[PDB]
Design a protein around this nucleic acid. Structure first.
Ligand SMILES: [K+]
Ligand SMILES: [K+]
Ligand SMILES: [K+]
Ligand SMILES: [K+]
Ligand SMILES: [K+]
Ligand SMILES: [K+]
Ligand SMILES: [K+]
Ligand SMILES: [K+]
Ligand SMILES: [K+]
Ligand SMILES: [K+]
Ligand SMILES: [K+]
Ligand SMILES: [K+]
Ligand SMILES: [K+]
Ligand SMILES: [K+]
Ligand SMILES: [K+]
Ligand SMILES: [K+]
Ligand SMILES: [K+]
Ligand SMILES: [K+]
Ligand SMILES: [K+]
Ligand SMILES: [K+]
Ligand SMILES: [K+]
Ligand SMILES: [K+]
Ligand SMILES: [K+]
Ligand SMILES: [K+]
Ligand SMILES: [K+]
Ligand SMILES: [Mg+2]
Ligand SMILES: [Mg+2]
Ligand SMILES: [Mg+2]
Ligand SMILES: [Mg+2]
Ligand SMILES: [Mg+2]
Ligand SMILES: [Mg+2]
Ligand SMILES: [Mg+2]
Ligand SMILES: [Mg+2]
Ligand SMILES: [Mg+2]
Ligand SMILES: [Mg+2]
Ligand SMILES: [Mg+2]
Ligand SMILES: [Mg+2]
Ligand SMILES: [Mg+2]
Ligand SMILES: [Mg+2]
Ligand SMILES: [Mg+2]
Ligand SMILES: [Mg+2]
Ligand SMILES: [Mg+2]
Ligand SMILES: [Mg+2]
Ligand SMILES: [Mg+2]
Ligand SMILES: [Mg+2]
Ligand SMILES: [Mg+2]
Ligand SMILES: [Mg+2]
Ligand SMILES: [Mg+2]
Ligand SMILES: [Mg+2]
Ligand SMILES: [Mg+2]
Ligand SMILES: [Mg+2]
Ligand SMILES: [Mg+2]
Ligand SMILES: [Mg+2]
Ligand SMILES: [Mg+2]
Ligand SMILES: [Mg+2]
Ligand SMILES: [Mg+2]
Ligand SMILES: [Mg+2]
Ligand SMILES: [Mg+2]
Ligand SMILES: [Mg+2]
Ligand SMILES: [Mg+2]
Ligand SMILES: [Mg+2]
Ligand SMILES: [Mg+2]
Ligand SMILES: [Mg+2]
Ligand SMILES: [Mg+2]
Ligand SMILES: [Mg+2]
Ligand SMILES: [Mg+2]
Ligand SMILES: [Mg+2]
Ligand SMILES: [Mg+2]
Ligand SMILES: [Mg+2]
Ligand SMILES: [Mg+2]
Ligand SMILES: [Mg+2]
Ligand SMILES: [Mg+2]
Ligand SMILES: [Mg+2]
Ligand SMILES: [Mg+2]
Ligand SMILES: [Mg+2]
Ligand SMILES: [Mg+2]
Ligand SMILES: [Mg+2]
Ligand SMILES: [Mg+2]
Ligand SMILES: [Mg+2]
Ligand SMILES: [Mg+2]
Ligand SMILES: [Mg+2]
Ligand SMILES: [Mg+2]
Ligand SMILES: [Mg+2]
Ligand SMILES: [Mg+2]
Ligand SMILES: [Mg+2]
Ligand SMILES: [Mg+2]
Ligand SMILES: [Mg+2]
Ligand SMILES: [Mg+2]
Ligand SMILES: [Mg+2]
Ligand SMILES: [Mg+2]
Ligand SMILES: [Mg+2]
Ligand SMILES: [Mg+2]
Ligand SMILES: [Mg+2]
Ligand SMILES: [Mg+2]
Ligand SMILES: [Mg+2]
Ligand SMILES: [Mg+2]
Ligand SMILES: [Mg+2]
Ligand SMILES: [Mg+2]
Ligand SMILES: [Mg+2]
Ligand SMILES: [Mg+2]
Ligand SMILES: [Mg+2]
Ligand SMILES: [Mg+2]
Ligand SMILES: [Mg+2]
Ligand SMILES: [Mg+2]
Lengths: 49, 64, 80
RNA sequence: UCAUAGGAUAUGAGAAGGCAGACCCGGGGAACUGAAACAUCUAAGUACCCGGAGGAAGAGAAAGCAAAUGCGAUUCCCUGA
RNA sequence: GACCGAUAGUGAACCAGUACCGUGAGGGAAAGGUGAAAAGCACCCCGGAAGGGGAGUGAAAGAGAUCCUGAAACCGUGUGCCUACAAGUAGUCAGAGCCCGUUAACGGGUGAUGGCGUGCCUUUUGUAGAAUGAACCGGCGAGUUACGAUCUCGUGCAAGGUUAAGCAGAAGAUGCGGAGCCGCAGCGAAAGCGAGUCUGAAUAGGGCGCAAGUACGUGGUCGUAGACCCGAAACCAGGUGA
RNA sequence: GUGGGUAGGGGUGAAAUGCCAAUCGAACCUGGAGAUAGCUGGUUCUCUCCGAAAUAGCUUUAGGGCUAGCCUCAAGGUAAG
RNA sequence: UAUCCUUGGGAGUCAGACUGCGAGUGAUAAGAUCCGUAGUCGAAAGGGAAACAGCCCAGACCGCCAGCUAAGGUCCCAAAGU
RNA sequence: AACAGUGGUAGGAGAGCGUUCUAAGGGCUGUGAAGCCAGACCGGAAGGACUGGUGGAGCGCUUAGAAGUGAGAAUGCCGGUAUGAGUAGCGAAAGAGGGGUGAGAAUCCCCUCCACCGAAUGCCUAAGGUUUCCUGAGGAAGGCUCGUCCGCUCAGGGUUAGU
RNA sequence: AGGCCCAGGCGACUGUUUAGCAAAAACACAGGUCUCUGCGAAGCCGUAAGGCGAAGUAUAGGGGCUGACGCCUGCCCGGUGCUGGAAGGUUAAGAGGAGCGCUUAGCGUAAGCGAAGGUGCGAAUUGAAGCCCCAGUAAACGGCGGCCGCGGUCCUAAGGUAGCGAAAUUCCUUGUCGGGUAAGUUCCGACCCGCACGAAAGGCGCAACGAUCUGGGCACUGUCUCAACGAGAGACUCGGUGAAAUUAUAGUACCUGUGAAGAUGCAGGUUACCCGCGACAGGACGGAAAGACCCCGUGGAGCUUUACUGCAGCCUGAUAUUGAAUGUUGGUAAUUGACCUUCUAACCCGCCGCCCUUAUCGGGCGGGGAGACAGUGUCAGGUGGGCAGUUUGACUGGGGCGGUCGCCUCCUAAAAGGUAACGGAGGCGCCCAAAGGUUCCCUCAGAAUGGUUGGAAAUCAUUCGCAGAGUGUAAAGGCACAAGGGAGCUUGACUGCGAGACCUACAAGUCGAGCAGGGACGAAAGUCGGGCUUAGUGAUCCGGUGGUUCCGCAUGGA
C-alpha cells in the first residue's frame, strides 16, 4: 500500500499465460555424468536411484 | 497459516536468476498516437523493479 | 469577503545548464549542456541534439571555449 | 340409494418432553468489519433462529479418476499448494 | 503437567449462580489458614456487659476465635536535636552548636545560618506551567503465542540437504517411513531451446543469465490471526418489557 | 379503581419526535464481540556505544501513509570521501 | 584530515521554533506568513544577558576545599580596579 | 602500554541485573527456612551480602533451560486508609414537672396539667407486605442523639365460618 | 370568600400538549371544501389465513387541506400532479427463425469446398401497461412581470382583483404626521416607497372566551427613594452523633517585571512574630462534566429529495393451472396459430337450503352466481424516499462561500542546479500532407527621394538600413556561415535497435553517436528516425480491431 498512490503492481500490465501442458525436465550436465564409470548405461532410473 | 501470494503481483512480475524482479512497462495499453516511436520501442522492452519498490513488495512474492 | 488570484501557475523546472565540468573526462554520449537554442555551440567531437542538448561524440576531456567574439562552444578532445 | 364423512368402543412399553452451552446433517440466515470511502466483493453460509438425529453423523460400492504394458466404493491424515 | 496457588486458578477452594440488583429477560459479588491435639483459658480480681489484669493449658496465648505470617498508607504515646522577625517545589552544597556511638568508617542523629534551586508524567516549536494525569498506600494491570515468510548468527551434512502423515516406542528420545519440499540452470508470454536464451531478417546490437545450498535452533522484522493494552458513538441477530 | 389489548425497521400519539418501567431522532437484555477507532490515553529493570527528523515526491492527501532524504547494525570494497 | 561507496537487517521522522543575513506576501506591521542561507533550540546541562528553549560564551564519563581562561565583569548586594 | 574519545529525545546496537518455574550437580535449614523489621556494609548501575529482632518450615548456590519476568502515571481495576473536620447535617410539629424502673434516663413506664389533628393525624377495608401481631427476656448491631425502649435480637405463643 | 377599568395583536369558544426548563399564537374542535370508495368498498394490519372498516353501505366510510360565526375567496392549466384520451412515435419477457459461425460423412495432388446431425449465436415480423403526445383540472403541487413616455413596448402560463398594510410580515427605521407622557426606539390611529401582505399553507372583520402576548389608567402598596425594628428556622456556644465533593508534595504574602505572551511558588524589591475562631468571596485561569459552539475523522445516527443503487407494494404482458363449441382471419401440407362470441366441467363465491352439528369456523351434498376470466406460481416491463444500504473531494492565514486542481514559459529564485505562498504575468488540451525531408538559391522591418489611378499606408526604382523583421502558436532562450524567405524532387512524420548520458522516490520523462534493413534528396561529401527549441496529454483493469512459426484441459479441431 502506497497511501492511496496507485500501487506499483496495479500501474504495470499483466503479462503472459501459464501453459497447461508445460514440460520441465530434470537437467543433467556432463560434469554429473563423470561420476559414473565407463561402460555404465546411464538410465533415468539409475540417475534417480 | 501459510502466507498468501499477492496474486495481482504474481501476474505482473517474475524472478530473474540473481533474484531481481522482471516487469513490463506502463503506458503500453493504448493512446499510441500520443507517444513517439522511440518511446514505444523502449516501453515495449522489459524492465527491473527498482530497489525502493523491491523493499516494499519483496515479501508479497515470497512463495514464487 | 475576499477575491481571488488569476495566477498561481508554473511549469516544472527543466534542470538546464552544464552537466560536465571543463577538464572532466567524459564517455561518448555524455550530455555536456542542456539548453533552449544555442547558448553554447557544439565544438569538436560534440553533437547538438534535437532539443539543443550538447553531447560528447567521443571519449575525451571536456573543454568550454570562446567561439569568436560573442559566442561560446564546448569541445571534447581525445586523451593522449 | 348403496355408501362415504362423522360417531362409538377395544388393543398399543406408538408419539409428545428433556438435554452435553460439545460433535453431525438439513431449513432459514445477518451485520459490524475488510476493501484504508462504497454499492459487486468481504466478513460468511459465520453468528443466530428452526427442524432432525446418532453414538457418532454425513459419505459410500463408479453414468468415477484419468490418459498408463492404467486405477478400482467411501471417509480421514500427509502432500500437491 | 518447566499449569494456578486465594486480587491467582472456575463466576464459585467457603452452603454461589447464593447474597444483592432488575417488572422481566438478565446482571452478579465478597468471603480460605487457632493449635500436633481443644488441651477452646477452672479459679481470683475491676466491670451491668463488652473488655481487660492475673492464674492455668500449650513449644508458643504478642497462636484466645474473619485466632499462621502480619508490609505500606493512616492513627497514636514517649522524647534526643531544632523551632514564635519568618517569604519556604522543601532539597542540595557549606556549616557551627547540641546529642549519640557504628557492618569503624577522612562515623550517626539534629540543624542556627550562608549559597544554589519553579515537583513527576504526558504532550509539545516551546510547559514551573494559569495544558494533561495521579488523594495516599498496597496488590493487579500492556509487543504474546501459533502457523507461514525473510535476514543475521549457530550447528550438521554439502552439489546436495531434508523427510511429512503414519507404524513401533514413556504422551519421550529414537528407529522405520523418500511420498513430498528446496537447491544443483538459465532464458522466453509460450512452443521451446539450453550455458545460454529472448528480441530481431541478422554470425548485429541490447535484456536477463553463464563465466552453496539445505535441515534444524536462538535472535531481529514482516504476514495471517483481537496481534502491545484500555476506550466509542453505532450496526446486526435472537429474546424480555404496556 | 380493577381486569385486559397493541412491542421496537414496532407500538401509541387532540402531534411535543411526545410517550413505551427515573432509558427514546428509534426501549431493554444477551449474543455476533476482544466490532472498528489513520483518534486520545497508557506501555513496568540498568548501564554503555552510536544518534536523527520535523524535508521532497505522490496520495479523497493534508495531525495518516508510502518511496526517497537523514539514524543505526553487519558484511564487503578498500582509501574512493 | 578520515571519511566515502556498495549490499543486506532494524528504525524513527513527514506540527518545527527563534536569531542573523537574502527575498516574496503584509503596511519594507506582527513573537505574522512563506521560501533561501548559517547558527542555536528541538535532543544541550554549565557561565553571561536580573528572571528569560531559540541571543553572547561554551558542549556535562566520574571525583578534588588545585590552576588558567571565555562571554561578561571588578563601589555594596556580588567574585575581581573606588 | 600509548593515543584518542565518552551531552542526548525519536530510534538502532551491545553488555548486564533481578523475578517464578524446570534439569543436573552441590548445599543450607527446628542448633531456626521463606517472609517481615532495622542497621553506619559491598558492587559502575540494575542490585547483592552480613548482623540483630520477628517468624515458625522451608530455601539458596552453580551451570543451562523456559517465561503470566520487573509499574509511578492509563479521569486504569480491586482493597485499605486519609484530607476536607469534630466541619455540613441529624428529614415540617409542644411540652413541662412529679413519681417509677435501672449500672446508667431530656429520650422507657405511670400520673398531672398543657398542646396538636378532627371530610382527619379518627374508625373500617383493598392492593401490597408476610409474622411486622401478643407475652416474657435482651441491648452487640439497626434506630441519624440516647435508650432500661422499639416495627430491632432471643424464646414461646396467637389467625376457629353452611351464612 | 372577585381587584377593577380602557385599548390593541393572536387564537372563535370548553378542551389538548413537550412526565422532569416551552401551556402557547402550537394541537384539537364544530363548520367548510376537495378527493377516493357500489361493498370480498376504498383505506388499513398481516407472507397468508384472519381481521379492523362495519354486524356500517354514498345523508356511509377512508384520506388531504382549511378551521366558530359574518362578508368573501380574483387571475394563470405553460410546468408538475391527478383524471381522461384520438391519431402519430417509442418500448420487455415470450413468440418467430431469414441468415451466419464451429464440427465433418463425403470430396479434393494440396490449398480449399462441404451433405446430414449436433452445437453456438441470431435479423425481419409480432409483443402490454408505461412514456412521448393530446384534452381537462388550482379549497391540486404551484405561479400571480420588466422597461419607457392612462398609452407604448418587451416578456410571460398569466402578470396580485377585493380586502388589508412600517404588520407575530417593513431591511432602510426610532419612516412621516397625529394621539397619549414633563419627557414614549414600546403602544394606539392614520399615511403607503408592501426590502419581502393578499384571498381555504385562506383574506378581511368579529360579540363571547384566555394562568395568551402588548400599551395605558384607577386602587394599592417596602418594588423603589432608603432603609429601620420585631418573631421564628438555620448560622453562633455547649453536650451527643457525624458525612461529602476535592486533594502531586507544600513551611502556600505584596508590587513591578519575567516566562507557553494573565505567577503563592521565577527575578528584583517591598512587607510579614507563632496558633486559632466568626465573617467575605478577589485569586488559586477554583470544583463539577475528556466543550454542546467551532474545526477535524475518507466516525456515526435521524431526516429529505428530480443524488446513486436497490427492495416492498401497486400496475401491466407472456406462460402454467386451462377445457369444449361456433364464427372470422393468418401461416405451413389437412393440421396448427391469431382473435371474436358462446358454452360448462376445472378454478372462485365474505350467496341460499340441507347434513356432519347444541357451530356466523371448516367440510360434504344440492341450488344459484361467476367462469377458463379471476386467483395463485414462474418470467418480464413500468411505477415506486413507502422502505433499505450508501455517496455527497481536497487545498484554504478557522470553516463555509468564492477561487484553484494536470501540462508549458517567464519573474520572484539570493550569477550551477533546485527552491515556497489563495506571490507577480501569460499560454496548452493543438496545428501543418507542408508549416516535414533534402538539394540549390536568397535576405528582413522601417525610412528617405521620385512616381497616372494612389492617399499616411497597395505596386515599382534608387540609396540608407544588425535585424529596429521573421520564426504556425504563450513566453524565454536561440537564429542573418540563418533556425528567417523562395524553388525543384520527395515521404526518414522510416523498421529493428542502441555504447553512453541527463532527469528522477517510484512510475514515467529527455538526449544520443553508432550498427543493420530498405529508402529520399544530392555530382559527391553528406543530411534525414517530423516541425528553431521547450506545452498540445492520462497508469492499470476491462473491451474492440488487425497481425501471429505461441498455448489449446484425452486426441483432432474449436
Ligand atoms: K457490508
Ligand atoms: K477503512
Ligand atoms: K471472583
Ligand atoms: K516524634
Ligand atoms: K538551604
Ligand atoms: K483545561
Ligand atoms: K545475449
Ligand atoms: K550451514
Ligand atoms: K525468524
Ligand atoms: K504482532
Ligand atoms: K429499535
Ligand atoms: K412514534
Ligand atoms: K427497565
Ligand atoms: K540501512
Ligand atoms: K531564517
Ligand atoms: K529471618
Ligand atoms: K493509578
Ligand atoms: K378542613
Ligand atoms: K425491651
Ligand atoms: K401542540
Ligand atoms: K413603560
Ligand atoms: K502554559
Ligand atoms: K474567593
Ligand atoms: K488567521
Ligand atoms: K522543400
Ligand atoms: Mg495492446
Ligand atoms: Mg521554468
Ligand atoms: Mg523534435
Ligand atoms: Mg470500508
Ligand atoms: Mg448409529
Ligand atoms: Mg441412541
Ligand atoms: Mg450413516
Ligand atoms: Mg494471601
Ligand atoms: Mg476467585
Ligand atoms: Mg426481586
Ligand atoms: Mg508474634
Ligand atoms: Mg504452622
Ligand atoms: Mg495473625
Ligand atoms: Mg527567633
Ligand atoms: Mg525586622
Ligand atoms: Mg500549542
Ligand atoms: Mg498553580
Ligand atoms: Mg488533552
Ligand atoms: Mg486530577
Ligand atoms: Mg496506585
Ligand atoms: Mg439498518
Ligand atoms: Mg410481552
Ligand atoms: Mg399487562
Ligand atoms: Mg421514561
Ligand atoms: Mg465479528
Ligand atoms: Mg522509509
Ligand atoms: Mg520551515
Ligand atoms: Mg513565526
Ligand atoms: Mg542553495
Ligand atoms: Mg518533539
Ligand atoms: Mg547540535
Ligand atoms: Mg544560559
Ligand atoms: Mg542566572
Ligand atoms: Mg525543557
Ligand atoms: Mg586569572
Ligand atoms: Mg567583592
Ligand atoms: Mg554519546
Ligand atoms: Mg562531553
Ligand atoms: Mg534494540
Ligand atoms: Mg518462593
Ligand atoms: Mg538474617
Ligand atoms: Mg507482568
Ligand atoms: Mg466545634
Ligand atoms: Mg470549614
Ligand atoms: Mg460553621
Ligand atoms: Mg449545624
Ligand atoms: Mg426529626
Ligand atoms: Mg385545634
Ligand atoms: Mg409489638
Ligand atoms: Mg444509638
Ligand atoms: Mg384557544
Ligand atoms: Mg416540560
Ligand atoms: Mg411549564
Ligand atoms: Mg381478505
Ligand atoms: Mg368484519
Ligand atoms: Mg390551520
Ligand atoms: Mg384561490
Ligand atoms: Mg395542458
Ligand atoms: Mg409609565
Ligand atoms: Mg401569508
Ligand atoms: Mg391558498
Ligand atoms: Mg387562519
Ligand atoms: Mg382553556
Ligand atoms: Mg457540636
Ligand atoms: Mg522556561
Ligand atoms: Mg513577556
Ligand atoms: Mg505577571
Ligand atoms: Mg520573589
Ligand atoms: Mg474550572
Ligand atoms: Mg474534548
Ligand atoms: Mg434514505
Ligand atoms: Mg456498512
Ligand atoms: Mg477541508
Ligand atoms: Mg478562509
Ligand atoms: Mg466552492
Ligand atoms: Mg545561487
Ligand atoms: Mg539558478
Ligand atoms: Mg480496477
Ligand atoms: Mg483438446
Amino acid at each position: 500500500f502506497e497511501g492511496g498512490q496507485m500501487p506499483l503492481f496495479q500501474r504495470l500490465p499483466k503479462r503472459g499465460f501459464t501453459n497447461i501442458n508445460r514440460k520441465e525436465y530434470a537437467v543433467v550436465n556432463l560434469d554429473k555424468l563423470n561420476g559414473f564409470a565407463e561402460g555404465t548405461e546411464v538410465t533415468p532410473e539409475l540417475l534417480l536411484e | 497459516p501459510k502466507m498468501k501470494t499477492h496474486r495481482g503481483s504474481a501476474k505482473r512480475f517474475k524472478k530473474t536468476g540473481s533474484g531481481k524482479l522482471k516487469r513490463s512497462h506502463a503506458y503500453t495499453s493504448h493512446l499510441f498516437a500520443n507517444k513517439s516511436q522511440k518511446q514505444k520501442r523502449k516501453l515495449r522492452k522489459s524492465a527491473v523493479v527498482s530497489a525502493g519498490d523491491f523493499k516494499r513488495i519483496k515479501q508479497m512474492l515470497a512463495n514464487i | 469577503g475576499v477575491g481571488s488570484t488569476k495566477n498561481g501557475r508554473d511549469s516544472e523546472a527543466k534542470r538546464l545548464g552544464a552537466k560536465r565540468a571543463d577538464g572532466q573526462f567524459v564517455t561518448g554520449g555524455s550530455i555536456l549542456y542542456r539548453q533552449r537554442g544555442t547558448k553554447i555551440y557544439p565544438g569538436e567531437n560534440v553533437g547538438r541534439g534535437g532539443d539543443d542538448t550538447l553531447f560528447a561524440k567521443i571519449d575525451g576531456t571536456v573543454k568550454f571555449e570562446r567561439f569568436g567574439r560573442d559566442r561560446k562552444k564546448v569541445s571534447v578532445y581525445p586523451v593522449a
